[PDB]
Coordinates of C-alpha atoms in Angstrom, one line a residue:
Chain A
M1 CA 149.6 -49.3 -69.9
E2 CA 149.2 -52.3 -72.1
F3 CA 152.5 -51.6 -73.9
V4 CA 154.4 -51.5 -70.6
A5 CA 152.7 -54.6 -69.3
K6 CA 153.6 -56.5 -72.5
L7 CA 157.2 -55.3 -72.4
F8 CA 157.6 -56.3 -68.8
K9 CA 156.1 -59.7 -69.4
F10 CA 158.3 -60.2 -72.4
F11 CA 161.6 -59.4 -70.4
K12 CA 160.5 -61.6 -67.5
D13 CA 159.6 -64.4 -69.9
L14 CA 163.0 -64.1 -71.5
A15 CA 164.8 -63.9 -68.2
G16 CA 163.0 -67.1 -67.1
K17 CA 164.1 -68.8 -70.3
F18 CA 167.7 -67.8 -69.9
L19 CA 167.8 -68.7 -66.2
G20 CA 165.6 -71.8 -66.6
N21 CA 162.1 -71.7 -65.1
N22 CA 161.3 -75.5 -64.5
Chain B
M1 CA 149.0 -53.5 -79.7
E2 CA 148.7 -56.6 -81.9
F3 CA 152.0 -55.9 -83.7
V4 CA 153.9 -55.7 -80.4
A5 CA 152.2 -58.8 -79.1
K6 CA 153.0 -60.8 -82.2
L7 CA 156.6 -59.5 -82.2
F8 CA 157.1 -60.6 -78.6
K9 CA 155.5 -64.0 -79.2
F10 CA 157.8 -64.5 -82.1
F11 CA 161.0 -63.7 -80.2
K12 CA 159.9 -65.8 -77.3
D13 CA 159.1 -68.7 -79.7
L14 CA 162.5 -68.4 -81.3
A15 CA 164.3 -68.2 -78.0
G16 CA 162.5 -71.3 -76.9
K17 CA 163.6 -73.1 -80.1
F18 CA 167.2 -72.1 -79.7
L19 CA 167.3 -73.0 -76.0
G20 CA 165.1 -76.0 -76.4
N21 CA 161.6 -76.0 -74.9
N22 CA 160.8 -79.7 -74.3
Chain C
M1 CA 148.5 -57.8 -89.4
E2 CA 148.2 -60.8 -91.6
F3 CA 151.4 -60.2 -93.5
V4 CA 153.4 -60.0 -90.1
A5 CA 151.7 -63.1 -88.8
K6 CA 152.5 -65.0 -92.0
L7 CA 156.1 -63.8 -91.9
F8 CA 156.5 -64.8 -88.3
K9 CA 155.0 -68.2 -88.9
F10 CA 157.3 -68.8 -91.9
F11 CA 160.5 -67.9 -90.0
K12 CA 159.4 -70.1 -87.0
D13 CA 158.6 -72.9 -89.4
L14 CA 162.0 -72.6 -91.1
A15 CA 163.7 -72.4 -87.7
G16 CA 161.9 -75.6 -86.7
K17 CA 163.0 -77.3 -89.9
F18 CA 166.7 -76.3 -89.5
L19 CA 166.8 -77.2 -85.8
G20 CA 164.5 -80.3 -86.2
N21 CA 161.0 -80.2 -84.7
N22 CA 160.3 -84.0 -84.0
Chain D
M1 CA 148.0 -62.0 -99.2
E2 CA 147.6 -65.1 -101.4
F3 CA 150.9 -64.4 -103.2
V4 CA 152.8 -64.2 -99.9
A5 CA 151.1 -67.3 -98.6
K6 CA 152.0 -69.3 -101.8
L7 CA 155.6 -68.0 -101.7
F8 CA 156.0 -69.1 -98.1
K9 CA 154.5 -72.5 -98.7
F10 CA 156.7 -73.0 -101.7
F11 CA 160.0 -72.2 -99.7
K12 CA 158.9 -74.3 -96.8
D13 CA 158.0 -77.2 -99.2
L14 CA 161.5 -76.9 -100.9
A15 CA 163.2 -76.7 -97.5
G16 CA 161.4 -79.8 -96.4
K17 CA 162.5 -81.6 -99.7
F18 CA 166.1 -80.6 -99.2
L19 CA 166.3 -81.5 -95.5
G20 CA 164.0 -84.5 -95.9
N21 CA 160.5 -84.5 -94.5
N22 CA 159.7 -88.2 -93.8
Chain E
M1 CA 147.4 -66.3 -109.0
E2 CA 147.1 -69.3 -111.2
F3 CA 150.4 -68.7 -113.0
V4 CA 152.3 -68.5 -109.7
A5 CA 150.6 -71.6 -108.4
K6 CA 151.5 -73.5 -111.5
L7 CA 155.1 -72.3 -111.5
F8 CA 155.5 -73.3 -107.9
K9 CA 154.0 -76.7 -108.5
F10 CA 156.2 -77.3 -111.5
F11 CA 159.5 -76.4 -109.5
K12 CA 158.3 -78.6 -106.6
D13 CA 157.5 -81.4 -109.0
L14 CA 160.9 -81.1 -110.6
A15 CA 162.7 -80.9 -107.3
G16 CA 160.9 -84.1 -106.2
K17 CA 162.0 -85.8 -109.4
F18 CA 165.6 -84.8 -109.0
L19 CA 165.7 -85.7 -105.3
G20 CA 163.5 -88.8 -105.7
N21 CA 160.0 -88.7 -104.2
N22 CA 159.2 -92.5 -103.6
Chain F
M1 CA 146.9 -70.5 -118.8
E2 CA 146.6 -73.6 -120.9
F3 CA 149.9 -72.9 -122.8
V4 CA 151.8 -72.7 -119.5
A5 CA 150.1 -75.8 -118.2
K6 CA 150.9 -77.8 -121.3
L7 CA 154.5 -76.5 -121.3
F8 CA 155.0 -77.6 -117.6
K9 CA 153.4 -81.0 -118.3
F10 CA 155.7 -81.5 -121.2
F11 CA 158.9 -80.7 -119.3
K12 CA 157.8 -82.8 -116.4
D13 CA 157.0 -85.7 -118.8
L14 CA 160.4 -85.4 -120.4
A15 CA 162.2 -85.2 -117.0
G16 CA 160.4 -88.3 -116.0
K17 CA 161.4 -90.1 -119.2
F18 CA 165.1 -89.1 -118.8
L19 CA 165.2 -90.0 -115.1
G20 CA 163.0 -93.0 -115.5
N21 CA 159.5 -93.0 -114.0
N22 CA 158.7 -96.7 -113.4
Chain G
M1 CA 146.4 -74.8 -128.5
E2 CA 146.1 -77.9 -130.7
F3 CA 149.3 -77.2 -132.5
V4 CA 151.2 -77.0 -129.2
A5 CA 149.6 -80.1 -127.9
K6 CA 150.4 -82.0 -131.1
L7 CA 154.0 -80.8 -131.0
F8 CA 154.4 -81.8 -127.4
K9 CA 152.9 -85.2 -128.0
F10 CA 155.2 -85.8 -131.0
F11 CA 158.4 -84.9 -129.1
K12 CA 157.3 -87.1 -126.1
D13 CA 156.4 -89.9 -128.5
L14 CA 159.9 -89.6 -130.2
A15 CA 161.6 -89.4 -126.8
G16 CA 159.8 -92.6 -125.8
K17 CA 160.9 -94.3 -129.0
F18 CA 164.5 -93.3 -128.6
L19 CA 164.7 -94.2 -124.8
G20 CA 162.4 -97.3 -125.2
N21 CA 158.9 -97.2 -123.8
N22 CA 158.1 -101.0 -123.1
Chain H
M1 CA 145.9 -79.0 -138.3
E2 CA 145.5 -82.1 -140.5
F3 CA 148.8 -81.4 -142.3
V4 CA 150.7 -81.2 -139.0
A5 CA 149.0 -84.3 -137.7
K6 CA 149.9 -86.3 -140.9
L7 CA 153.5 -85.0 -140.8
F8 CA 153.9 -86.1 -137.2
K9 CA 152.4 -89.5 -137.8
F10 CA 154.6 -90.0 -140.8
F11 CA 157.9 -89.2 -138.8
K12 CA 156.8 -91.3 -135.9
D13 CA 155.9 -94.2 -138.3
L14 CA 159.3 -93.9 -140.0
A15 CA 161.1 -93.7 -136.6
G16 CA 159.3 -96.8 -135.5
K17 CA 160.4 -98.6 -138.8
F18 CA 164.0 -97.6 -138.3
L19 CA 164.1 -98.5 -134.6
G20 CA 161.9 -101.5 -135.0
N21 CA 158.4 -101.5 -133.5
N22 CA 157.6 -105.2 -132.9
Chain I
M1 CA 145.3 -83.3 -148.1
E2 CA 145.0 -86.4 -150.3
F3 CA 148.3 -85.7 -152.1
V4 CA 150.2 -85.5 -148.8
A5 CA 148.5 -88.6 -147.5
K6 CA 149.3 -90.5 -150.6
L7 CA 152.9 -89.3 -150.6
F8 CA 153.4 -90.3 -147.0
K9 CA 151.8 -93.7 -147.6
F10 CA 154.1 -94.3 -150.6
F11 CA 157.3 -93.4 -148.6
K12 CA 156.2 -95.6 -145.7
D13 CA 155.4 -98.4 -148.1
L14 CA 158.8 -98.1 -149.7
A15 CA 160.6 -97.9 -146.4
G16 CA 158.8 -101.1 -145.3
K17 CA 159.9 -102.8 -148.5
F18 CA 163.5 -101.9 -148.1
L19 CA 163.6 -102.8 -144.4
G20 CA 161.4 -105.8 -144.8
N21 CA 157.9 -105.7 -143.3
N22 CA 157.1 -109.5 -142.7
Chain J
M1 CA 173.0 -51.7 -64.3
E2 CA 173.0 -51.2 -68.0
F3 CA 169.6 -52.9 -68.5
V4 CA 168.0 -50.5 -65.9
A5 CA 169.7 -47.6 -67.4
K6 CA 168.5 -48.5 -70.9
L7 CA 165.0 -49.2 -69.6
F8 CA 164.8 -45.8 -67.9
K9 CA 166.2 -44.0 -71.0
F10 CA 163.6 -45.7 -73.2
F11 CA 160.6 -44.7 -70.9
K12 CA 161.9 -41.2 -70.6
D13 CA 162.4 -41.0 -74.4
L14 CA 158.9 -42.3 -75.0
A15 CA 157.4 -39.9 -72.4
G16 CA 159.2 -37.0 -74.2
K17 CA 157.8 -38.1 -77.5
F18 CA 154.2 -38.4 -76.2
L19 CA 154.4 -35.0 -74.3
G20 CA 156.5 -33.4 -77.0
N21 CA 160.1 -32.4 -76.3
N22 CA 160.8 -29.4 -78.7
Chain K
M1 CA 172.5 -56.0 -74.0
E2 CA 172.5 -55.5 -77.8
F3 CA 169.1 -57.2 -78.2
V4 CA 167.5 -54.8 -75.7
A5 CA 169.2 -51.8 -77.2
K6 CA 168.0 -52.8 -80.7
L7 CA 164.5 -53.4 -79.4
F8 CA 164.3 -50.0 -77.7
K9 CA 165.6 -48.2 -80.8
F10 CA 163.1 -50.0 -82.9
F11 CA 160.1 -49.0 -80.7
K12 CA 161.4 -45.4 -80.4
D13 CA 161.9 -45.2 -84.2
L14 CA 158.3 -46.5 -84.8
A15 CA 156.9 -44.1 -82.2
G16 CA 158.7 -41.3 -83.9
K17 CA 157.2 -42.4 -87.3
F18 CA 153.7 -42.6 -86.0
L19 CA 153.9 -39.3 -84.1
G20 CA 155.9 -37.6 -86.8
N21 CA 159.6 -36.7 -86.1
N22 CA 160.2 -33.7 -88.4
Chain L
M1 CA 172.0 -60.2 -83.8
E2 CA 172.0 -59.7 -87.6
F3 CA 168.6 -61.4 -88.0
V4 CA 167.0 -59.0 -85.5
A5 CA 168.7 -56.1 -87.0
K6 CA 167.5 -57.0 -90.5
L7 CA 163.9 -57.7 -89.2
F8 CA 163.8 -54.3 -87.5
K9 CA 165.1 -52.5 -90.5
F10 CA 162.6 -54.2 -92.7
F11 CA 159.6 -53.2 -90.5
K12 CA 160.8 -49.7 -90.2
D13 CA 161.4 -49.5 -94.0
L14 CA 157.8 -50.8 -94.5
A15 CA 156.4 -48.4 -92.0
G16 CA 158.1 -45.5 -93.7
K17 CA 156.7 -46.6 -97.1
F18 CA 153.2 -46.9 -95.7
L19 CA 153.3 -43.5 -93.9
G20 CA 155.4 -41.9 -96.5
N21 CA 159.0 -40.9 -95.8
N22 CA 159.7 -38.0 -98.2
Chain M
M1 CA 171.4 -64.5 -93.6
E2 CA 171.4 -64.0 -97.3
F3 CA 168.0 -65.7 -97.8
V4 CA 166.5 -63.3 -95.2
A5 CA 168.1 -60.3 -96.8
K6 CA 166.9 -61.3 -100.2
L7 CA 163.4 -61.9 -99.0
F8 CA 163.3 -58.5 -97.3
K9 CA 164.6 -56.7 -100.3
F10 CA 162.0 -58.5 -102.5
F11 CA 159.0 -57.5 -100.3
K12 CA 160.3 -53.9 -99.9
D13 CA 160.8 -53.7 -103.7
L14 CA 157.3 -55.0 -104.3
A15 CA 155.8 -52.6 -101.7
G16 CA 157.6 -49.8 -103.5
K17 CA 156.2 -50.9 -106.8
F18 CA 152.6 -51.1 -105.5
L19 CA 152.8 -47.8 -103.6
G20 CA 154.9 -46.1 -106.3
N21 CA 158.5 -45.2 -105.6
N22 CA 159.2 -42.2 -108.0
Chain N
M1 CA 170.9 -68.7 -103.4
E2 CA 170.9 -68.2 -107.1
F3 CA 167.5 -69.9 -107.6
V4 CA 165.9 -67.5 -105.0
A5 CA 167.6 -64.6 -106.5
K6 CA 166.4 -65.5 -110.0
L7 CA 162.9 -66.2 -108.7
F8 CA 162.7 -62.8 -107.0
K9 CA 164.1 -61.0 -110.1
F10 CA 161.5 -62.7 -112.3
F11 CA 158.5 -61.7 -110.0
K12 CA 159.8 -58.2 -109.7
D13 CA 160.3 -58.0 -113.5
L14 CA 156.8 -59.3 -114.1
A15 CA 155.3 -56.9 -111.5
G16 CA 157.1 -54.0 -113.3
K17 CA 155.6 -55.1 -116.6
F18 CA 152.1 -55.4 -115.3
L19 CA 152.3 -52.0 -113.4
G20 CA 154.3 -50.4 -116.1
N21 CA 158.0 -49.4 -115.4
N22 CA 158.7 -46.5 -117.8
Chain O
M1 CA 170.4 -73.0 -113.1
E2 CA 170.4 -72.5 -116.9
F3 CA 167.0 -74.2 -117.3
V4 CA 165.4 -71.8 -114.8
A5 CA 167.1 -68.8 -116.3
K6 CA 165.9 -69.8 -119.8
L7 CA 162.3 -70.4 -118.5
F8 CA 162.2 -67.0 -116.8
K9 CA 163.5 -65.2 -119.8
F10 CA 161.0 -67.0 -122.0
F11 CA 158.0 -66.0 -119.8
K12 CA 159.3 -62.4 -119.5
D13 CA 159.8 -62.2 -123.3
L14 CA 156.2 -63.5 -123.9
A15 CA 154.8 -61.1 -121.3
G16 CA 156.5 -58.3 -123.0
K17 CA 155.1 -59.4 -126.4
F18 CA 151.6 -59.6 -125.1
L19 CA 151.7 -56.3 -123.2
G20 CA 153.8 -54.6 -125.9
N21 CA 157.4 -53.7 -125.2
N22 CA 158.1 -50.7 -127.5
Chain P
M1 CA 169.9 -77.2 -122.9
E2 CA 169.9 -76.8 -126.7
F3 CA 166.5 -78.4 -127.1
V4 CA 164.9 -76.0 -124.6
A5 CA 166.5 -73.1 -126.1
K6 CA 165.3 -74.0 -129.6
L7 CA 161.8 -74.7 -128.3
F8 CA 161.7 -71.3 -126.6
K9 CA 163.0 -69.5 -129.6
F10 CA 160.5 -71.2 -131.8
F11 CA 157.5 -70.2 -129.6
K12 CA 158.7 -66.7 -129.3
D13 CA 159.2 -66.5 -133.0
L14 CA 155.7 -67.8 -133.6
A15 CA 154.3 -65.4 -131.0
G16 CA 156.0 -62.5 -132.8
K17 CA 154.6 -63.6 -136.2
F18 CA 151.0 -63.9 -134.8
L19 CA 151.2 -60.5 -133.0
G20 CA 153.3 -58.9 -135.6
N21 CA 156.9 -57.9 -134.9
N22 CA 157.6 -55.0 -137.3
Chain Q
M1 CA 169.3 -81.5 -132.7
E2 CA 169.3 -81.0 -136.4
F3 CA 165.9 -82.7 -136.9
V4 CA 164.3 -80.3 -134.3
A5 CA 166.0 -77.3 -135.9
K6 CA 164.8 -78.3 -139.3
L7 CA 161.3 -78.9 -138.0
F8 CA 161.1 -75.5 -136.3
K9 CA 162.5 -73.7 -139.4
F10 CA 159.9 -75.5 -141.6
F11 CA 156.9 -74.5 -139.4
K12 CA 158.2 -70.9 -139.0
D13 CA 158.7 -70.7 -142.8
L14 CA 155.2 -72.0 -143.4
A15 CA 153.7 -69.6 -140.8
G16 CA 155.5 -66.8 -142.6
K17 CA 154.1 -67.9 -145.9
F18 CA 150.5 -68.1 -144.6
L19 CA 150.7 -64.8 -142.7
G20 CA 152.8 -63.1 -145.4
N21 CA 156.4 -62.2 -144.7
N22 CA 157.1 -59.2 -147.1
Chain R
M1 CA 168.8 -85.8 -142.5
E2 CA 168.8 -85.3 -146.2
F3 CA 165.4 -86.9 -146.6
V4 CA 163.8 -84.5 -144.1
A5 CA 165.5 -81.6 -145.6
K6 CA 164.3 -82.5 -149.1
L7 CA 160.7 -83.2 -147.8
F8 CA 160.6 -79.8 -146.1
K9 CA 161.9 -78.0 -149.2
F10 CA 159.4 -79.7 -151.3
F11 CA 156.4 -78.7 -149.1
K12 CA 157.7 -75.2 -148.8
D13 CA 158.2 -75.0 -152.6
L14 CA 154.6 -76.3 -153.2
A15 CA 153.2 -73.9 -150.6
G16 CA 155.0 -71.0 -152.4
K17 CA 153.5 -72.1 -155.7
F18 CA 150.0 -72.4 -154.4
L19 CA 150.2 -69.0 -152.5
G20 CA 152.2 -67.4 -155.2
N21 CA 155.9 -66.4 -154.5
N22 CA 156.5 -63.5 -156.8

C-alpha cells in the first residue's frame, strides 16, 4: 500500500498548492 | 519506493518554485 | 538512486537560478 | 557518479556566471 | 577524472575572464 | 596530465595578458 | 615536458614584451 | 634542451633590444 | 654548444653596437 | 470527473498487471 | 489533466517493464 | 508539459536499457 | 527545452555505450 | 547551445575511443 | 566557438594517436 | 585563431613523429 | 604569424633529422 | 624575417652535415 499512499499524498499536496493551503 | 518518493518530491518542489513557496 | 537524486537536484538548482532563489 | 557530479557542477557554475551569482 | 576536472576548471576560468570575475 | 595542465595554464596566461590581468 | 614548458614560457615572454609587462 | 634554451634566450634578447628593455 | 653560444653572443653584441648599448 | 475516471482506470490497469490479464 | 495522464502512463509503462509486457 | 514528457521518456528509455529492450 | 533534450540524449548515448548498443 | 552540443559530442567521441567504436 | 572546436579536435586527435586510429 | 591552430598542428605533428606516423 | 610558423617548421625539421625522416 | 630564416637554414644545414644528409 505504500505506492497508493504516496500517490494520494502527492495529489493532495499538489491540490493544496494549487488552491493555496495557508 | 525510493524512486517514486524522489519523483514526487521533485514535482512538488518544482510546483512550489513555480507558484512561489515563501 | 544516486543518479536520479543528482539529476533532480541539478534541475531544481537550475530552476532556482532562473526564477531567482534569494 | 563522479563524472555526472562534475558535469552538473560545471553547468550550474556556468549558469551562475551568466546570470550573475553575487 | 582528472582530465574532465581540468577541462571544466579551464572553461570556468576562461568564462570568468571574459565576463570579469572581480 | 602534465601536458594538459601546461596547455591550459598557457592559454589562461595568454587570455589574461590580452584582456589585462592587473 | 621540458620542451613544452620552455616553448610556453618563450611565447608568454614574447607576448609580454609586445604588450608591455611593466 | 640546451640548444632550445639558448635559441629562446637569443630571440628574447633580440626582441628586448629592438623594443627597448630599459 | 659553444659554437652556438658564441654565434648568439656575437649577433647580440653586433645588434647592441648598431642600436647603441649605452 | 475526468480525474476520478483516470484514477480508476489506472488502479484497474495496475491490478490487471499484477494479477495478469491475458 | 495532461500531467496526471502522463504520470499514470509512465507508472503503467514502468510496471509493464518490470513485470514484463511481451 | 514538454519537460515532464521528456523526463518520463528518458527514465523509460533508461529502464529499457537496464532491463534490456530487444 | 533544448538543453534538457541534449542532456538526456547524452546520458542515454553514454548508457548505450557502457551497456553496449549493437 | 553550441557549446553544450560540442562538449557532449567531445565526451561521447572520447568514450567511444576508450571503449572502442569499431 | 572556434577555439573550443579546435581544442576538442586537438584532444580527440591526440587520443586517437595514443590509442591508435588505424 | 591562427596561433592556436598552428600550435595544435605543431604538437600533433611532433606526436606523430615520436609515435611514428607511417 | 610568420615567426611562429618558421619556428615550428624549424623544430619539426630538426625532429625529423634526429629521428630520421626517410 | 630574413635573419630568422637564414639562421634556421644555417642550423638545419649544419645538423644535416653532422648527421649526414646523403
